[PDB]
Amino acid sequence: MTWNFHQYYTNRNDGLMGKLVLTDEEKNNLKALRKIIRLRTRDVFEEAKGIAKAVKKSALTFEIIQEKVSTTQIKHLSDSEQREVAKLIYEMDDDARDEFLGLTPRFWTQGSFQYDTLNRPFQPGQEMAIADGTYMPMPIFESEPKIGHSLLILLVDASLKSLVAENHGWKFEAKQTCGRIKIEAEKTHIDVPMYAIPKDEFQKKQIALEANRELDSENVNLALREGDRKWINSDPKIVEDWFNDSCIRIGKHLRKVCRFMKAWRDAQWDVGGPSSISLMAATVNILDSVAHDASDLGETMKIIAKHLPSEFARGVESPDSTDEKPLFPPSYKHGPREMDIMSKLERLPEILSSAESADSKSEALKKINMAFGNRVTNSELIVLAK
């Protein structure tokens, strides 16, 4: 016996894609959540700007400024955080205060929601994620921009915390690269990294955009929450463009197989396993260099599973040239975490082979479900090879 799994993988109702692709409820939910954060963040920034402009209008004391702060949504910060915001607004010099009054936060979602490879969570504790970056158009800087790193972080945190304060079952979490809202009961969290981008360039492109119906990566700076290094050059559009380009170059099946590999990962580890981006990059390298047939994703997945251990062993380069660190280290550097990852990857082609030569459709299903978990239950998707 030899079985074909193309329908197992791709059927949009009962097949693996049918089980991975977010429901409408889930997808509209994530969009509603993102919209809610965007609205509050713009509101919080206006409230702060309103105070700034009152300082510009007439020299207000520091005590008056603390008073005004305490009545805005910034009141959801800690009392030390609140006075920190008041101090920063009070201390801003004329140049910085003008720039701040010009600042309007802009938004852009990154990650799997944007790559369109966001899977429904499998194991308990696994969550849907969405990252919506907040971008701050400001003059080009080195060291520190006119509008402080500190002030920008506090206002974004104030936005998130004001939303948490309005929602039972929401929780705020501060991370090194973002603020986070988690809604455990909805298996959802939203990340908000903050970026500085050149203002003059942003304005120029925006005018052309509206007239005709991207920014220079080197000056896109990710804010870091702690440590000596407040900013780092990091442009999420690099990876985003690379992946979209890869999809065009390889074909529409690229997104499906990346979903399958992420689903494999979610089934093999409740927590941990290779990052999604290392799997996508390794898969892209394989499909770029190995002949395969998109009309049979059963066969294509066997090709992928066969070549992934070699990809990971030699180490997986980031498609972003400016990242020094690989997405995954080469063998001579592997510790326990990577060794565990190598063992799982080496097992995959064995699993897919045993499914292919199972005695029946029901056993073929059980065997391939060792790789992806028991999500697909309709064994009739599995057909005899011709």
Swiss-Prot record:
Q: How is the cofactor bound?
A: Binds 1 Mg(2+) ion per subunit.
Q: Name one GO biological process term.
A: defense response to virus
What cofactors are annotated for this protein? Mg(2+)
Phenotypic consequence of residue 106 to W: Abolishes enzyme activity
Residues in a coiled coil are none
**Enzyme nomenclature, EC number:** 2.7.7.-
Per the entry, induction is:
Expression is repressed by the transcriptional regulator VspR. Part of a CBASS operon consisting of capV-dncV-cap2-cap3.
What effect does gene inactivation have here? Cells lacking this gene show a significant defects in intestinal colonization.
**Post-translation: what modifications?**
In bacteria expressing capV-cdnD-cap2, this protein is conjugated to a number of other proteins (by Cap2 via this protein's C-terminal Gly residue), many of which are involved in metabolism. More conjugated protein is found in the absence of Cap3.
Miscellaneous note, as given in the UniProt record, is:
Overproduction of the cGAMP synthase DncV leads to an increase in intracellular cGAMP, and induces the formation of cells more translucent than normal with a defect in cell membrane integrity, planktonic growth arrest and a small colony phenotype in El Tor V.cholerae.
Q: What is this protein called?
A: Cyclic GMP-AMP synthase
Q: What is the lineage of its organism?
A: Bacteria, Pseudomonadati, Pseudomonadota, Gammaproteobacteria, Vibrionales
